[PDB]
Amino acid sequence: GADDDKPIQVTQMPQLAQQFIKQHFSDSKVALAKMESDFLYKSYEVIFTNGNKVEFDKKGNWEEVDCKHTSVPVAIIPAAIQKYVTTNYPDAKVLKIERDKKDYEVKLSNRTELKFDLKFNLIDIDN
């Protein structure tokens, strides 16, 4: 829970996560890194000085990239999802992307939320 939050240095994060930050957020500055946990999970969150955030699983694989203050770096977005978005919502940016073992969620700047299965088939549009 919230009481279990533990601030850490970026160097205490999994190496996969450290690499991801360097790869995609080289131009951003880290405001706070923490380990988030409860009885049955552990994750890592990094918040940048512009308010954007990335959350990683215990292995350092991203699970949430929330760039609502700018937009999500395109390299992170699966090509089939980027094509769907740029075809059908050409005036929107992707503000957040999430993934788990079953789907991707994408939140657009026009407030639409899309969900895709792991084979990038559309399974929900919410406006």
Site for a copy of itself, rule CB under 8 A: 1-2, 36, 38-41, 43, 55, 64, 66, 88, 100-103, 117, 121-126
DSSP H stretches of helix in 1-127: 15-24, 79-88
For a copy of itself, give the closer residue by CB, 22 or 38.
Answer: 38
Give the CB-side neighbour count of residue 47, counting CA atoms within 13 A. 8
- Please answer whether residues 109 and 67 qualify as being in contact, where contact means their C-beta atoms are separated by less than 8 angstroms: no
Residues of the shown chain interacting with Ca ion in the complex, contacts defined by CB under 5 A: 36, 55, 64, 124, 126
Say if residue 63 carries a ligand binding annotation. Answer: no
Shortest CB 88 distance to a copy of itself, Å: 7
Say if residue 64 carries a ligand binding annotation. Answer: yes
Q: Which residues are annotated as a binding site for Ca(2+)?
A: 36, 45, 55, 64, 105
